[PDB]
Short mmCIF file of C-alpha atoms in Angstrom, two decimals:
data_model
loop_
_atom_site.label_atom_id
_atom_site.label_comp_id
_atom_site.label_asym_id
_atom_site.label_seq_id
_atom_site.Cartn_x
_atom_site.Cartn_y
_atom_site.Cartn_z
CA UNK X 681 5.09 -3.67 3.11
CA UNK X 682 8.69 -2.40 3.66
CA UNK X 683 7.73 1.35 3.85
CA UNK X 684 6.97 1.54 7.58
CA UNK X 685 9.35 3.79 9.47
CA UNK X 686 9.38 4.80 13.22
CA UNK X 687 7.41 7.86 13.84
CA UNK X 688 5.37 7.65 10.63
CA UNK X 689 2.05 9.62 10.43
CA UNK X 690 2.66 11.78 13.51
CA UNK X 691 2.90 14.95 11.45
CA UNK X 692 -0.42 14.21 9.60
CA UNK X 693 -2.08 13.35 12.89
CA UNK X 694 -2.42 17.08 13.57
CA UNK X 695 -5.17 17.12 10.95
CA UNK X 696 -8.50 16.48 12.33
CA UNK X 697 -9.69 13.96 9.61
CA UNK X 698 -6.54 11.83 9.83
CA UNK X 699 -6.69 11.69 13.64
CA UNK X 700 -10.37 10.77 13.56
CA UNK X 701 -9.68 8.00 11.09
CA UNK X 702 -6.76 6.63 13.23
CA UNK X 703 -8.98 6.66 16.19
CA UNK X 704 -11.75 4.77 14.32
CA UNK X 705 -9.33 2.16 13.13
CA UNK X 706 -7.90 1.79 16.74
CA UNK X 707 -11.50 1.30 17.95
CA UNK X 708 -11.96 -1.31 15.20
CA UNK X 709 -8.98 -3.15 16.42
CA UNK X 710 -9.40 -2.45 20.09
CA UNK X 711 -10.50 -5.97 21.23
CA UNK X 712 -7.18 -7.56 20.45
CA UNK X 713 -5.34 -5.04 22.62
CA UNK X 714 -3.42 -3.12 19.94
CA UNK X 715 -3.72 0.65 19.63
CA UNK X 716 -2.57 2.07 16.36
CA UNK X 717 -2.34 5.46 17.98
CA UNK X 718 -0.02 4.02 20.70
CA UNK X 719 2.12 2.47 17.87
CA UNK X 720 2.42 5.81 15.98
CA UNK X 721 3.41 7.72 19.09
CA UNK X 722 5.56 4.71 20.14
CA UNK X 723 9.21 5.81 20.43
CA UNK X 724 10.90 2.46 20.14
CA UNK X 725 11.85 1.64 16.47
CA UNK X 726 11.00 -1.98 17.05
CA UNK X 727 7.31 -1.04 17.37
CA UNK X 728 7.08 -1.48 13.56
CA UNK X 729 9.48 -4.41 13.86
CA UNK X 730 6.43 -6.69 14.70
CA UNK X 731 4.78 -7.84 11.58
CA UNK X 732 1.34 -7.44 13.08
CA UNK X 733 2.22 -3.86 14.15
CA UNK X 734 3.69 -2.96 10.83
CA UNK X 735 0.65 -4.31 8.93
CA UNK X 736 -1.89 -2.68 11.08
CA UNK X 737 -0.19 0.80 11.02
CA UNK X 738 0.37 0.68 7.21
CA UNK X 739 -3.31 -0.14 6.67
CA UNK X 740 -4.45 2.53 9.11
CA UNK X 741 -2.17 5.18 7.35
CA UNK X 742 -3.36 4.16 3.97
CA UNK X 743 -6.97 4.38 4.99
CA UNK X 744 -6.48 7.73 6.61
CA UNK X 745 -4.84 9.04 3.38
CA UNK X 746 -7.80 7.79 1.33
CA UNK X 747 -10.12 9.43 3.68
CA UNK X 748 -8.25 12.78 3.44
CA UNK X 749 -8.28 12.49 -0.37
CA UNK X 750 -12.00 11.64 -0.43
CA UNK X 751 -12.56 14.62 1.89
CA UNK X 752 -11.54 16.89 -0.84
CA UNK X 753 -13.84 15.07 -3.18
CA UNK X 754 -11.27 13.15 -5.37
CA UNK X 755 -12.81 10.12 -6.88
CA UNK X 756 -10.14 7.64 -8.38
CA UNK X 757 -10.69 6.35 -11.87
CA UNK X 758 -8.35 3.44 -11.37
CA UNK X 759 -6.98 1.46 -8.33
CA UNK X 760 -3.93 -0.75 -8.11
CA UNK X 761 -2.47 -2.45 -5.05
CA UNK X 762 0.89 -4.12 -4.63
CA UNK X 763 1.00 -7.22 -2.43
CA UNK X 764 -0.31 -5.79 0.91
CA UNK X 765 -2.36 -2.72 0.62
CA UNK X 766 -4.74 -4.55 -1.73
CA UNK X 767 -7.16 -4.43 1.20
CA UNK X 768 -6.70 -0.60 1.29
CA UNK X 769 -7.41 -0.65 -2.43
CA UNK X 770 -10.67 -2.43 -1.61
CA UNK X 771 -11.59 0.15 0.95
CA UNK X 772 -10.99 2.86 -1.48
CA UNK X 773 -13.08 1.11 -4.09
CA UNK X 774 -15.90 0.82 -1.58
CA UNK X 775 -16.10 -2.95 -1.62
CA UNK X 776 -14.63 -2.99 1.85
CA UNK X 777 -15.33 -1.22 5.19
CA UNK X 778 -12.71 0.48 7.31
CA UNK X 779 -13.36 -1.90 10.15
CA UNK X 780 -13.41 -4.93 7.75
CA UNK X 781 -10.01 -3.87 6.17
CA UNK X 782 -8.33 -3.24 9.52
CA UNK X 783 -9.43 -6.46 10.95
CA UNK X 784 -8.48 -8.33 7.75
CA UNK X 785 -4.88 -6.85 7.92
CA UNK X 786 -4.59 -7.62 11.51
CA UNK X 787 -5.75 -11.22 11.06
CA UNK X 788 -3.37 -11.58 8.17
CA UNK X 789 -0.45 -10.54 10.37
CA UNK X 790 -1.56 -12.61 13.35
CA UNK X 791 -1.85 -15.82 11.30
CA UNK X 792 1.47 -14.94 9.71
CA UNK X 793 3.21 -15.04 13.09
CA UNK X 794 1.33 -18.08 14.20
CA UNK X 795 2.74 -20.08 11.30
CA UNK X 796 6.28 -19.79 12.79
CA UNK X 797 7.73 -20.92 9.47
CA UNK X 798 11.44 -21.15 8.62
CA UNK X 799 12.95 -17.79 7.85
CA UNK X 800 12.20 -16.32 4.43
CA UNK X 801 13.86 -13.51 2.69
CA UNK X 802 13.41 -11.61 -0.65
CA UNK X 803 16.14 -9.75 -2.61
CA UNK X 804 15.38 -7.42 -5.49
CA UNK X 805 17.09 -8.66 -8.68
CA UNK X 806 18.00 -6.57 -11.71
CA UNK X 807 17.46 -9.50 -13.85
CA UNK X 808 14.13 -9.28 -15.86
CA UNK X 809 11.07 -11.49 -15.12
CA UNK X 810 11.64 -14.17 -17.69
CA UNK X 811 15.31 -14.79 -17.33
CA UNK X 812 15.11 -14.88 -13.51
CA UNK X 813 12.10 -17.07 -13.26
CA UNK X 814 13.76 -19.83 -15.48
CA UNK X 815 17.10 -19.28 -13.83
CA UNK X 816 15.63 -19.46 -10.33
CA UNK X 817 17.20 -22.29 -8.20
CA UNK X 818 14.90 -24.93 -6.56
CA UNK X 819 12.94 -23.23 -3.72
CA UNK X 820 13.12 -19.72 -5.20
CA UNK X 821 10.45 -18.32 -7.50
CA UNK X 822 9.44 -14.93 -8.91
CA UNK X 823 8.06 -13.04 -5.87
CA UNK X 824 6.74 -9.81 -7.38
CA UNK X 825 6.77 -8.65 -11.05
CA UNK X 826 7.44 -5.00 -10.06
CA UNK X 827 8.68 -3.99 -13.66
CA UNK X 828 10.34 -5.32 -16.68
CA UNK X 829 13.80 -4.45 -15.44
CA UNK X 830 13.26 -5.33 -11.76
CA UNK X 831 11.87 -8.61 -10.35
CA UNK X 832 11.71 -9.79 -6.84
CA UNK X 833 11.94 -13.37 -5.63
CA UNK X 834 11.09 -15.07 -2.30
CA UNK X 835 12.27 -18.42 -0.82
CA UNK X 836 14.48 -19.97 1.87
CA UNK X 837 17.18 -17.52 2.94
CA UNK X 838 19.97 -19.99 1.87
CA UNK X 839 19.15 -20.41 -1.83
CA UNK X 840 18.04 -16.79 -1.95
CA UNK X 841 21.36 -15.61 -0.58
CA UNK X 842 23.29 -18.01 -2.86
CA UNK X 843 21.55 -16.74 -6.00
CA UNK X 844 21.91 -13.19 -4.83
CA UNK X 845 25.67 -13.44 -4.52
CA UNK X 846 25.88 -15.41 -7.81
CA UNK X 847 23.97 -12.62 -9.67
CA UNK X 848 26.12 -9.96 -7.96
CA UNK X 849 29.07 -11.92 -9.43
CA UNK X 850 27.76 -11.12 -12.87
CA UNK X 851 27.28 -7.56 -11.69
CA UNK X 852 23.50 -7.65 -12.08
CA UNK X 853 21.71 -5.34 -9.65
CA UNK X 854 20.86 -7.22 -6.49
CA UNK X 855 19.48 -6.16 -3.16
CA UNK X 856 17.72 -8.04 -0.34
CA UNK X 857 14.38 -6.41 0.79
CA UNK X 858 13.33 -6.22 4.40
CA UNK X 859 10.82 -9.10 4.62
CA UNK X 860 10.72 -9.20 8.36
CA UNK X 861 12.79 -12.45 8.07
CA UNK X 862 9.86 -14.34 6.45
CA UNK X 863 8.87 -15.04 2.81
CA UNK X 864 5.63 -14.07 1.13
CA UNK X 865 3.68 -14.89 -2.16
CA UNK X 866 5.35 -18.32 -2.18
CA UNK X 867 4.57 -21.96 -1.34
CA UNK X 868 5.43 -21.08 2.29
CA UNK X 869 2.20 -18.99 2.77
CA UNK X 870 0.26 -21.96 1.30
CA UNK X 871 0.30 -23.65 4.90
CA UNK X 872 -1.21 -20.54 6.45
CA UNK X 873 -4.04 -20.38 4.01
CA UNK X 874 -6.61 -22.51 5.88
CA UNK X 875 -6.47 -20.60 9.26
CA UNK X 876 -6.22 -17.18 7.52
CA UNK X 877 -9.27 -17.99 5.39
CA UNK X 878 -11.17 -19.12 8.50
CA UNK X 879 -10.41 -15.84 10.32
CA UNK X 880 -11.28 -13.73 7.30
CA UNK X 881 -14.64 -15.53 6.95
CA UNK X 882 -15.19 -14.90 10.56
CA UNK X 883 -14.42 -11.22 9.75
CA UNK X 884 -15.90 -10.97 6.20
CA UNK X 885 -19.48 -12.00 6.15
CA UNK X 886 -20.90 -10.20 3.06
CA UNK X 887 -18.45 -10.15 0.31
CA UNK X 888 -19.19 -7.34 -2.28
CA UNK X 889 -18.31 -7.33 -6.01
CA UNK X 890 -14.95 -5.78 -7.22
CA UNK X 891 -15.57 -2.62 -9.18
CA UNK X 892 -14.44 -2.24 -12.72
CA UNK X 893 -11.78 0.33 -11.84
CA UNK X 894 -9.86 -1.88 -9.39
CA UNK X 895 -7.31 -4.00 -11.28
CA UNK X 896 -6.38 -7.20 -9.42
CA UNK X 897 -2.65 -7.70 -9.31
CA UNK X 898 -2.88 -11.24 -7.86
CA UNK X 899 -5.36 -12.64 -10.37
CA UNK X 900 -3.92 -12.79 -13.96
CA UNK X 901 -5.92 -10.75 -16.47
CA UNK X 902 -7.08 -14.00 -18.17
CA UNK X 903 -8.97 -14.82 -14.93
CA UNK X 904 -10.37 -11.30 -14.17
CA UNK X 905 -13.85 -12.71 -14.92
CA UNK X 906 -13.35 -15.69 -12.61
CA UNK X 907 -15.30 -16.23 -9.36
CA UNK X 908 -12.42 -14.78 -7.24
CA UNK X 909 -12.14 -11.52 -9.11
CA UNK X 910 -15.87 -10.91 -8.95
CA UNK X 911 -15.94 -10.12 -5.12
CA UNK X 912 -13.37 -9.14 -2.64
CA UNK X 913 -14.03 -12.30 -0.64
CA UNK X 914 -11.65 -13.72 1.96
CA UNK X 915 -10.54 -16.18 -0.63
CA UNK X 916 -9.39 -13.37 -2.90
CA UNK X 917 -7.31 -11.93 -0.05
CA UNK X 918 -5.78 -15.29 0.84
CA UNK X 919 -4.90 -15.85 -2.89
CA UNK X 920 -3.52 -12.17 -2.90
CA UNK X 921 -1.21 -13.26 -0.07
CA UNK X 922 -0.20 -16.62 -1.72
CA UNK X 923 -0.14 -15.84 -5.39
CA UNK X 924 2.76 -13.88 -7.10
CA UNK X 925 2.28 -10.16 -7.41
CA UNK X 926 1.71 -9.20 -11.14
CA UNK X 927 2.13 -5.57 -10.41
CA UNK X 928 3.84 -4.98 -13.82
CA UNK X 929 1.09 -6.49 -15.83
CA UNK X 930 -1.61 -4.14 -14.55
CA UNK X 931 0.54 -0.96 -15.16
CA UNK X 932 -0.02 -1.43 -18.95
CA UNK X 933 -3.67 -0.52 -18.58
CA UNK X 934 -2.87 2.92 -17.16
CA UNK X 935 -4.22 5.55 -19.68
CA UNK X 936 -1.83 8.04 -21.22
CA UNK X 937 -1.53 11.34 -19.33
CA UNK X 938 -2.97 9.74 -16.06
CA UNK X 939 -2.17 11.34 -12.83
CA UNK X 940 -0.93 8.70 -10.49
CA UNK X 941 -0.84 9.16 -6.66
CA UNK X 942 1.14 6.87 -4.42
CA UNK X 943 -0.98 6.14 -1.48
CA UNK X 944 1.67 5.09 1.04
CA UNK X 945 3.50 6.09 4.21
CA UNK X 946 6.79 6.21 2.17
CA UNK X 947 6.99 6.75 -1.56
CA UNK X 948 8.81 3.43 -2.17
CA UNK X 949 7.45 2.51 -5.60
CA UNK X 950 8.05 5.82 -7.29
CA UNK X 951 11.08 4.66 -9.25
CA UNK X 952 9.25 1.56 -10.33
CA UNK X 953 6.29 3.77 -11.55
CA UNK X 954 8.56 6.01 -13.37
CA UNK X 955 10.44 3.27 -15.22
CA UNK X 956 7.38 1.13 -16.00
CA UNK X 957 4.74 3.76 -16.86
CA UNK X 958 4.05 5.89 -20.04
CA UNK X 959 6.27 9.07 -19.99
CA UNK X 960 3.12 11.26 -20.21
CA UNK X 961 2.20 10.03 -16.68
CA UNK X 962 2.83 12.03 -13.59
CA UNK X 963 3.64 10.75 -10.07
CA UNK X 964 2.98 12.32 -6.65
CA UNK X 965 4.49 10.81 -3.51
CA UNK X 966 2.06 12.13 -0.91
CA UNK X 967 4.47 11.13 1.93
CA UNK X 968 8.20 10.93 2.60
CA UNK X 969 10.10 8.74 4.91
CA UNK X 970 11.50 10.68 7.89
CA UNK X 971 10.51 14.02 6.41
CA UNK X 972 10.62 17.06 8.66
CA UNK X 973 7.02 17.75 8.26
CA UNK X 974 4.95 15.19 6.43
CA UNK X 975 1.91 17.64 6.39
CA UNK X 976 4.02 20.01 4.29
CA UNK X 977 4.90 17.25 1.91
CA UNK X 978 1.30 16.16 1.66
CA UNK X 979 0.11 19.76 0.97
CA UNK X 980 2.78 20.09 -1.68
CA UNK X 981 1.54 16.94 -3.29
CA UNK X 982 -1.99 18.28 -3.32
CA UNK X 983 -0.64 21.50 -4.87
CA UNK X 984 1.12 19.42 -7.56
CA UNK X 985 -2.11 17.63 -8.07
CA UNK X 986 -3.91 21.09 -8.65
CA UNK X 987 -1.18 22.02 -11.16
CA UNK X 988 -1.96 18.82 -13.02
CA UNK X 989 -5.49 19.92 -14.04
CA UNK X 990 -7.31 17.90 -11.40
CA UNK X 991 -9.48 19.95 -9.06
CA UNK X 992 -8.83 19.59 -5.31
CA UNK X 993 -9.91 22.06 -2.62
CA UNK X 994 -7.49 22.26 0.42
CA UNK X 995 -10.14 23.94 2.53
CA UNK X 996 -11.77 20.63 3.30
CA UNK X 997 -8.67 19.40 5.17
CA UNK X 998 -8.89 22.14 7.90
CA UNK X 999 -11.86 23.20 10.04
CA UNK X 1000 -14.40 25.35 8.32
CA UNK X 1001 -13.95 29.08 8.42
CA UNK X 1002 -16.92 30.90 10.15
CA UNK X 1003 -18.63 33.49 7.88
CA UNK X 1004 -18.97 36.28 7.17
CA UNK X 1005 -15.23 37.09 7.11
CA UNK X 1006 -13.93 39.65 9.67
CA UNK X 1007 -13.86 43.30 8.76
CA UNK X 1008 -10.57 44.36 7.36
CA UNK X 1009 -9.93 41.39 5.09
CA UNK X 1010 -7.96 42.46 2.05
CA UNK X 1011 -9.82 43.31 -1.13
CA UNK X 1012 -9.57 40.62 -3.78
CA UNK X 1013 -10.77 42.49 -6.88
CA UNK X 1014 -7.40 44.39 -7.23
CA UNK X 1015 -5.40 41.11 -7.40
CA UNK X 1016 -7.19 39.91 -10.55
CA UNK X 1017 -5.14 40.36 -13.74
CA UNK X 1018 -6.31 39.87 -17.27
#
């Protein structure tokens, strides 16, 4: 979360595949009365202010991007999700269905609102994971282990603000992240677990095993053989919501020279990936916040991908060209140089 911005995805909606995927997601979530397309074309900035709308739109956009990438034939060798979007990771891995993932995200959002818990805020802290975790005041714990340098914590706004100001007193980098006014990955969510799991079981009926490529970021590596990690069951998603995000831990398994694509409406985690990844790795945003033409940025990302040695054919994105070609098409043989 935290990447949604007003007007996101409109540029890419011009593509046939993306619009079709968005329509399918909207149909999937149709019964509840929410239209992802309506949200995307929505003009009010507050449209993404709603947690439900933000979650649904983010999941839909991630699924659409995955569909576009699969259209060209790209087959990921690894998969890593960070807090929300784990469900999108599941859909990419094949263990989940588009309708299943969309419904899961929507139900997560809905149950989140129905909790009506006290306000919760997260602030990014320049302090490392170990020092912050021990230094955390009561009611504040390590929220997400983004990287060695940067760790985020979640808790009641009062102690969170007090510790943020105290840390800023030392000069350590501090910054509050837009949490929608509510905490995550903390004891707070623990209350919401029962109803959320009930809804997911109502939604998830045939859990499928997690693939080898997918690396759970909510299940510590020592437990990756556990019952939870085996299948992307509703319980796994609930734990994903409640448990701390061990994003940094999984990064160490990224092989050298790997090409890392950031499947997201906004390339938020680019800096974290650069800091916490092997220098040989390469990063490609695939989408920029409030960019003039997100389609151009996506095409540039695909081009950079092609420059990286991976094979991707842009023709799949657009409608097929009828053949044979019209007479007068320029000769190609003269253009070849040896």
